[PDB]
Design a protein around this ligand. Structure first.
Ligand SMILES: O=S(=O)(O)OC[C@H]1O[C@H](O[C@H]2[C@@H](O)[C@@H](CO)O[C@@H](O[C@@H]3[C@H](O)[C@@H](OS(=O)(=O)O)[C@@H](O)O[C@@H]3COS(=O)(=O)O)[C@@H]2OS(=O)(=O)O)[C@H](O)[C@@H](O)[C@H]1O
Ligand SMILES: O=S(=O)(O)OC[C@H]1O[C@@H](O)[C@H](O)[C@@H](O)[C@H]1O
Ligand SMILES: [Ca+2]
Ligand SMILES: [Ca+2]
Ligand SMILES: [Cl-]
Ligand SMILES: [Cl-]
Ligand SMILES: [Cl-]
Lengths: 483, 484
């Protein structure tokens, strides 16, 4: 029973790592993991946005089965208290489970809004986690406080904490009223309550003692992960290290500012690599690294301009955050879900590069197979046993895989890519995010071997292929049991 | 005997046209040719630099056979006067042949330096062209004058013209002396004589009346091309419209400044498309567009920072000038030679998109086949007959193609790409050009189907494939006669 450490980066694109070809940023720690492990070139998150991908990561099922969308800071937990989750699965075989970082899976129960001043339940502790130290929503969503287990860290009863997303509450300055105090400019959605010089989404009243310090996320989070690892060093443990990097607002520690010529976004990649090093080296000191299944991946494709004036697009230079793939965050094109995926397990995995169609949804069933945990017919219905290609870069994995986004759905059948037509008009992606969302009123079909960036639609040349793929996409939607 | 008009752009990247996916720039006129003809996605120039590719375009053979490198402004002509060339071949079937634009193939005879004040021979007129309106070297190399046939245009005997690439000559202001006069900053190689407010490579003395005006290149070149077309409308003709766009310095006409959010480089693409349109509309106006074989392609891959402070890199935004391919100008990676290539011929070409491995070198032998011109065994020894894939997107073309750059040679065998190792160190490509030259002390091998940006070197996992690909490269280097 090896330990499992899951590095889950926020918005890390296929090309944002030097082992994936980046030249404007060096990721040495993550690169050494790829060198002594398997690097996947065709691995995918379940969706093109955070909440849905995180839901599939932990439940082994497609996010559309529960219509998961980007959650707001006070949304209720999307994972039922009895739902079968990956951490619960590992618990039944003695693993001590923990998560350090971003949650974004909801925290309340729905009936009554979240009272950030009393115990916050259900949450990570109710869906398979023993220990939890989180960032409730996202780095840019209030509350800007750490929630340990069931309690908000450093909360003073003398200064109760409240949040509101529709109107201003409290006496904190905002970005629209007080733009003078901002460290970075913000768009309309992100110009509310200011905390640590940066406005966020929504208003935050009180709880000043519970306020976090963005520039120390690297230290605070690595410190917690190292402690949890030290506490569970003599037993099997699973640690989901969920980063805030490289999600907006990008506020890296001063020791990284200027390490790249790309601005805060690039420097956040440097910080992210450093943080990863702290955890990896911690496992090395305790001689646990060779017997640890390390998985380094991301929740969705990269984005440059995501709401703050941080120079991501202006100073991009020659950097290709999505490598050769088109799209990015929010998009149905490859880059929306095609991301970095590294497996590092020296005791059982030989170094290699895998071009197998791999999905993060299959982590649940592949880890069950690793430890012999039989799965119910109703458990992680979409998660397939793909442990063999996970540990051998030469083995094949999937043939078919559905890609999700709020705007459209798509399907991969070997090198074929099909995007189902939609009438939804989503211009905010192209306008505000500088990404083609991939929608179209007409079907789309691409051969990624000759057209890797999805520039030549073949829907009209192979109309039966479109119908076949559309048919197989319907079957997967109608599926309700395993296999 | 259809008319043949060949548009040859300078440094146009695979993704610089909107019909190849560009979103930050619009090329409506050029896209119109793609919608009505074949768009090639795996077509390649012979080399990753100007002069080597141009030589291969007109001689039908690899440039390394004569060690052609980027030519200085006063270089002698690299095409022998007795050497068979594509324009000559067309001359023997009654075609009137002309060239308007960038030459960059040398002009002296090699024994004496070109005297710009006398007739310049041998030039395009001695290698198969009837008419020629030229930019001698490049927009950034002196002389900054026009050469029509054998004489410099608007040259006054009262002000003789001289060039010198080793030391300053004449009284013209320079970039290293008069920075306050420049419209754009220039690196050390481009800070010499100032002409029209932009320093160039080399020093220019005299010939003021013959100086060109960069910003009106679009009008001067399109007018010359329109005259030539208008006059040869009675006879079959071959026009090589060799663009300066989008090479440095990028000085588009006023009517295009601000059309894109990428600065001078992006606005030159706009001007480039407009100039192309002016020529296409002249063919239509004269009812020749349908009976005209129009080929639109590029001499080598794209570059952003090439010598002038023109914001090409600071304002690139989301533009992917090279599409998904790695490298660019000067590189042995795909983007060095993988370029836009469109064939517009309404009387014999149906609209399509072709993924066939296609080489510009084959244009000589494919056009010969179109006209039934038998080729000698020692002529265009690298030019293969690929007329079937040139006119039908569904037909295959090449299986093997050798790629050139001064530091390394490469080979393509279907989707496999092999880069022969080299001890050469070209640091300026990364330092100043912001492009990866593709050099490596060790062999490189890629599967472009799974690794389109050549990121995963497979040379170690397939040592026999490397050997076989390296062997195939030697055979093409030793070949001296036509194949098959
Ligand atoms: O018409 S095009 O082919 O499309 O444009 C041609 C370009 O010519 C220049 O670019 C380089 C080219 O001449 C190359 C020859 O293969 O040599 C390069 O010079 C390098 C160094 O760059 C140079 O640096 S310097 O301080 O500015 O003088 C110097 O170190 O010498 C080497 C040559 O040695 S070698 O080629 O390895 O054997 C040219 O680039 S540059 O000097 O860096 O600017 C031109 O710069 C481009 O604008 C195009 O005009
Ligand atoms: O990575 S995610 O957590 O899914 O991002 C959620 C996003 O919502 C968008 O509408 C915001 O404008 C972004 O700033 C970002 O916060
Ligand atoms: Ca995310
Ligand atoms: Ca060029
Ligand atoms: Cl208190
Ligand atoms: Cl389309
Ligand atoms: Cl701009």
């Amino acid at each position: 029973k090896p330990n499992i450490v899951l590095f889950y980066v926020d918005d890390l694109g296929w090309g944002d790592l030097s082992s994936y070809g980046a030249t404007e940023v060096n990721t040495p720690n993550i690169d050494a993991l790829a060198k002594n492990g398997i690097r996947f070139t065709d691995a995918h998150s379940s969706a093109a946005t955070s909440s849905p991908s995180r839901y599939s990561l932990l439940t082994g099922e497609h996010a559309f089965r529960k219509n998961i969308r980007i959650l707001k800071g006070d949304a209720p937990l999307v994972i039922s208290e009895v739902q079968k989750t990956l951490p619960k699965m590992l618990q039944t075989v003695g693993y001590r489970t923990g998560i350090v970082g971003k949650w974004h899976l909801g925290l309340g129960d729905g009936n009554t809004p979240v009272n950030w001043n009393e115990k916050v339940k259900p949450g990570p502790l109710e869906v398979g986690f023993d220990y939890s130290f989180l960032i409730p929503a996202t780095g840019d969503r209030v509350p800007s406080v750490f929630l340990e287990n069931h309690d908000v860290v450093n909360l003073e009863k003398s200064d109760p904490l409240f949040v509101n997303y529709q109107k201003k509450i409290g006496q904190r300055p905002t970005g629209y009223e007080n733009p003078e105090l901002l460290k970075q400019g913000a768009d309309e959605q992100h110009n509310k309550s200011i905390i640590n010089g940066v406005s966020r989404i929504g208003w935050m009243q009180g709880g000043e003692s519970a306020e976090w310090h963005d520039e120390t996320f690297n230290i605070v989070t690595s410190d917690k992960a190292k402690q949890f690892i030290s506490e569970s060093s003599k037993q099997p443990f699973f640690l989901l290290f969920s980063f805030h990097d490289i999600h907006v607002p990008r506020l890296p520690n001063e020791m990284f500012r200027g390490k790249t010529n790309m601005g805060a976004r690039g420097d956040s990649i440097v910080q992210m690599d450093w943080t990863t090093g702290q955890v990896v080296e911690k496992l090395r000191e305790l001689n646990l690294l060779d017997n640890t299944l390390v998985i380094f991946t991301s929740d969705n494709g990269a984005v440059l301009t995501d709401g703050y004036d941080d120079e991501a697009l202006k100073r991009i230079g020659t950097h290709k955050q999505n490598g050769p793939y088109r799209g990015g965050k929010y998009s149905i094109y490859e880059a929306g879900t095609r991301i970095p995926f590294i497996v590092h397990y020296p005791n059982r995995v030989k170094p290699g590069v895998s071009n197998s169609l791999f999905s993060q949804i299959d982590l649940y069933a592949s880890i069950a197979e690793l430890l012999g945990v039989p799965l119910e017919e109703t458990e992680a219905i979409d998660s397939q046993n793909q442990l063999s290609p996970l540990f051998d870069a030469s083995k094949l994995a999937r043939k078919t895989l559905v890609q999700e986004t709020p705007h459209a759905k798509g399907l991969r059948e070997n090198s074929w890519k099909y995007i189902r037509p939609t009438e939804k008009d989503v211009a905010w992606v192209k306008a505000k995010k500088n990404i083609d969302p991939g929608t179209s009123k007409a079907p789309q079909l691409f051969d990624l071997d000759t057209d890797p960036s999805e520039l030549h639609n073949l829907a009209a040349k192979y109309p039966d292929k479109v119908k076949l793929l559309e048919q197989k996409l319907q079957d997967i939607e109608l599926q309700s049991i395993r296999l």
